[PDB]
UniProtKB/TrEMBL annotation, chain B:
It comes from the Eukaryota. Residues 7-86 form the Ig-like domain. The lineage of its organism: Eukaryota, Metazoa, Chordata, Craniata, Vertebrata. It comes from Ginglymostoma cirratum. This is Novel antigen receptor. Coiled coil: none annotated. It is found in: Secreted.
Length: 101, 92
């Protein structure tokens, strides 16, 4: 039942030349159950700028991607970003977090 | 400051490729050297010219590996020598 959650920081390239900051939560599972990803920024619920893609199936695995678009200024304010992924019929959410280096 | 980016699962799934990215943050001169499985790796390496903005210099080097090689679990390292700082990664 356990999902693997990988949280991708915005790249310095994105920050410098795109002038945006996009965080990407990639969720992998060996089970077909649907996945919801909930984001917080600075300890507050964030719905704006969140886009979830429909789950993709490979052979025996399932990939669910959620992206959070943030400003370069928000990323470079040092606030914490959290993604919480939870899969139907699983027991507990899996949480990952990040902030500027 | 050396930031090493793993291939994303989306890249592995959709593009069937695995590209690692080393982003490096005084001098504009920096050379990035890669190792895979403890050996020099030149093949699949592309550096971009150093970028200048404010008091800072940004240099990007990309290593095009393969899905097979990434999934094999071997270690990748990038070493940035400024006018070295090393970062390492491997599949979990």
């Amino acid at each position: 039942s356990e999902i693997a959650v990988l949280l991708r920081d915005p790249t310095v390239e994105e920050i410098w030349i795109d002038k945006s900051a996009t965080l990407v939560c990639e969720v992998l599972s060996t089970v077909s159950a649907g996945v919801v990803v909930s984001w917080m920024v600075n300890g507050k619920v964030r719905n704006e700028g969140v886009q979830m893609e429909p789950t993709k199936m490979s052979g025996n695995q399932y990939l669910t991607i959620s992206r959070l678009t943030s400003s370069v200024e928000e990323w470079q304010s040092g606030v914490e970003y959290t993604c919480s992924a939870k899969q139907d019929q699983s027991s507990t959410p899996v949480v990952k977090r990040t902030r500027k280096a």
